[PDB]
Amino acid sequence: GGPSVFLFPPKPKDTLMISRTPEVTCVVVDVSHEDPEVKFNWYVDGVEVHNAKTKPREEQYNSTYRVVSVLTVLHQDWLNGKEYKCKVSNKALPAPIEKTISKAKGQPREPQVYVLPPSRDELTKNQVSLLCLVKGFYPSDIAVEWESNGQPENNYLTWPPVLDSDGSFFLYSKLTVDKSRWQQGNVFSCSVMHEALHNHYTQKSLSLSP
Amino acid sequence: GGPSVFLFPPKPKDTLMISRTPEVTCVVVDVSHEDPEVKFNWYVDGVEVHNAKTKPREEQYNSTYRVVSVLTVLHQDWLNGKEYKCKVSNKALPAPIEKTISKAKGQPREPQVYVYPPSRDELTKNQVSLTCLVKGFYPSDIAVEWESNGQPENNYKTTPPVLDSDGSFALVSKLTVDKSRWQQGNVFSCSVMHEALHNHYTQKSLSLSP
Ligand SMILES: *[C@@H]1O[C@H](CO[C@@H]2O[C@@H](C)[C@@H](O)[C@@H](O)[C@@H]2O)[C@@H](O[C@@H]2O[C@H](CO)[C@@H](O[C@@H]3O[C@H](CO[C@H]4O[C@H](CO)[C@@H](O)[C@H](O)[C@@H]4O[C@@H]4O[C@H](CO)[C@@H](O[C@@H]5O[C@H](CO)[C@H](O)[C@H](O)[C@H]5O)[C@H](O)[C@H]4NC(C)=O)[C@@H](O)[C@H](O[C@H]4O[C@H](CO)[C@@H](O)[C@H](O)[C@@H]4O[C@@H]4O[C@H](CO)[C@@H](O)[C@H](O)[C@H]4NC(C)=O)[C@@H]3O)[C@H](O)[C@H]2NC(C)=O)[C@H](O)[C@H]1NC(C)=O
Numbered sequence: 001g002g003p004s005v006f007l008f009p010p011k012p013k014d015t016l017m018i019s020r021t022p023e024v025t026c027v028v029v030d031v032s033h034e035d036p037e038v039k040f041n042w043y044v045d046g047v048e049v050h051n052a053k054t055k056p057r058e059e060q061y062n063s064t065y066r067v068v069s070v071l072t073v074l075h076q077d078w079l080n081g082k083e084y085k086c087k088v089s090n091k092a093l094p095a096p097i098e099k100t101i102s103k104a105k106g107q108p109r110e111p112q113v114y115v116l117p118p119s120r121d122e123l124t125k126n127q128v129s130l131l132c133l134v135k136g137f138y139p140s141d142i143a144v145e146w147e148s149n150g151q152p153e154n155n156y157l158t159w160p161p162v163l164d165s166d167g168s169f170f171l172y173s174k175l176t177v178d179k180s181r182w183q184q185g186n187v188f189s190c191s192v193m194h195e196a197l198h199n200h201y202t203q204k205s206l207s208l209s210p
Numbered sequence: 211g212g213p214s215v216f217l218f219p220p221k222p223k224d225t226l227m228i229s230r231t232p233e234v235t236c237v238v239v240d241v242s243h244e245d246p247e248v249k250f251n252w253y254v255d256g257v258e259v260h261n262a263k264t265k266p267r268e269e270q271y272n273s274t275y276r277v278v279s280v281l282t283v284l285h286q287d288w289l290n291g292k293e294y295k296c297k298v299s300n301k302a303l304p305a306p307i308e309k310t311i312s313k314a315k316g317q318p319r320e321p322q323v324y325v326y327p328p329s330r331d332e333l334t335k336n337q338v339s340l341t342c343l344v345k346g347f348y349p350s351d352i353a354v355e356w357e358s359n360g361q362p363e364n365n366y367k368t369t370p371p372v373l374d375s376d377g378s379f380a381l382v383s384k385l386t387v388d389k390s391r392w393q394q395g396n397v398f399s400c401s402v403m404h405e406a407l408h409n410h411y412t413q414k415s416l417s418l419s420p
């Protein structure tokens with residue numbers, strides 16, 4: 001069995017924040033010792049680009065090399081729906097394998113973000129639940145984070161988006177905080193990043209109301 | 211080659227609610243046109259039963275037959291972890307197919323159920339979201355439903371359950387109601403059904419203060 005190619009997209013968050021650097025990653029596995037050479041061609045909307053970076057081959061414990069090329073994408077190219085093509089050629093192949101990736105299609109919809117304090121009934125436990133409901137968004141690529149006092153929160157979990165009856169996605173994120181911190185008046189913030197937000201980011205805060 | 215067999219568990223609401231009737235379902239597809247006869251053996255912890263009823267086979271568009279055998283299960287057997295085995299016999303099967311199924315394993319933990327009123331921010335919109343958080347449950351089989359003044363309110367979606375940071379599951383269900391109904395004081399309740407609850411059932415309610 002000849003070599004195989006897997007093509008990976010930027011992290012949504014990397015495409016949304018200008019300070020980060022999104023990458024499309026082209027991975028070849030099952031390369032042979034007899035046919036070690038692997039070259040990469042990269043196309044954006046069909047037009048060859050030359051600026052990628054290809055690491056040196058590496059041998060897997062199974063006696064094949066794995067070779068990785070990384071293309072840096074511009075934020076707005078990705079967001080503008082450009083198609084990234086990895087073409088991987090190698091003498092153990094009848095013809096060079098081409099792969100193509102790009103952002104999910106569909107009209108963007110701006111998320112609404114709402115935060116909700118813990119239920120009265122929970123105010124009895126050792127830890128409590130702060131909720132961030134994000135709804136009405138499209139496409140489903142999104143990042144949701146929590147923080148407090150200039151530091152991230154650890155213990156949150158955020159369910160996968162699902163498709164809401166009206167054609168858009170929603171999700172929640174649950175932050176658990178020991179009741180003391182909550183009772184002591186610490187402010188907690190849910191940050192949302194999504195291409196259809198202004199600045200690709202919004203944040204909503206809440207704290208105990210006495 | 212030949213037929214393949216898939217074995218499906220009862221709906222959770224059906225195992226939890228004693229008036230309802232839970233079924234295990236044994237499905238066979240790619241049954242041949244020339245050896246279309248299929249024989250089912252059903253076992254519960256090894257003992258054969260003889261109460262299943264076979265649907266009459268059904269032609270699929272793709273030229274193959276699909277055959278269903280449905281076994282009615284006792285609520286308490288399923289809940290006590292009895293294993294259900296379906297054995298399928300076809301001419302094209304050098305050997306009968308065996309599949310086994312039983313309820314998800316794990317020490318049951320009782321869910322805590324909380325209900326969140328709409329965010330003050332949302333009150334400005336025409337529709338508002340009511341939120342039901344159910345957390346700390348084990349296993350993940352559960353059924354969550356909304357009602358008001360006794361009637362099903364089905365304009366809601368529920369995230370699938372996902373592990374929380376203690377090995378238990380959590381889930382959130384969102385009910386969307388016209389803002390008019392909310393401020394008018396109608397009461398809304400989240401019904402939750404789970405093997406680790408008392409009588410397998412509880413209901414929490416919310417409404418806007420007169
Ligand atoms: C010819 O056609 C037939 C029929 O196809 C139909 O018509 C054709 C012509 C096409 O148009 C096609 O599009 C149409 O669908 C083909 O049959 C299909 O074959 C494939 C396999 O090749 C089947 O694939 C498996 O599907 C499982 C899930 O199926 C359910 O959900 C799908 C939709 O998501 C439905 O289509 C099915 O009907 C099943 O739906 C469920 O039905 C249950 C019984 O009715 C319901 O439960 C009962 O419901 C009643 C009331 O309804 C009561 O509630 C009862 O109490 C209750 O019991 C249930 O609600 C319902 N669920 C849903 C969601 O709707 C997959 O689970 C399965 O995946 C596993 O196995 C795969 C192996 O192929 C593997 O790749 C996966 O990784 C996964 O592996 C498993 O993992 C589990 C862990 O959970 C392990 O425990 C397992 O061991 C492991 N399996 C392994 C490794 O063995 C398959 O993907 C497909 O379902 C089937 N379609 C049918 C029957 O409609 C046929 O293939 C065609 N032939 C040819 C040559 O083309």
Ligand SMILES: *[C@@H]1O[C@H](CO[C@@H]2O[C@@H](C)[C@@H](O)[C@@H](O)[C@@H]2O)[C@@H](O[C@@H]2O[C@H](CO)[C@@H](O[C@@H]3O[C@H](CO[C@H]4O[C@H](CO)[C@@H](O)[C@H](O)[C@@H]4O[C@@H]4O[C@H](CO)[C@@H](O[C@@H]5O[C@H](CO)[C@H](O)[C@H](O)[C@H]5O)[C@H](O)[C@H]4NC(C)=O)[C@@H](O)[C@H](O)[C@@H]3O)[C@H](O)[C@H]2NC(C)=O)[C@H](O)[C@H]1NC(C)=O
Binds near residue numbers: 062
């Ligand atoms: C020979 O062995 C090779 C390599 O296997 C390794 O070594 C062997 C000896 C064993 O020790 C293995 O334990 C070890 O993995 C093996 O190759 C593998 O081949 C199979 C198919 O045959 C590949 O399976 C595919 O996997 C696809 C998804 O893979 C992702 O997730 C898996 C974990 O589930 C990882 O193992 C993969 O590395 C890969 O991880 C993803 O990597 C991409 C690109 O680096 C990440 O995207 C980038 O992330 C960075 C941040 O770091 C930036 O954000 C970039 O912007 C972004 O692009 C991505 O985040 C990450 N994801 C995760 C979850 O970590 C799957 O879709 C396919 O369907 C398929 O199942 C397998 O992955 C591959 N292993 C590799 C490439 O490492 C050969 O098959 C063996 N040959 C034989 C003959 O046995």
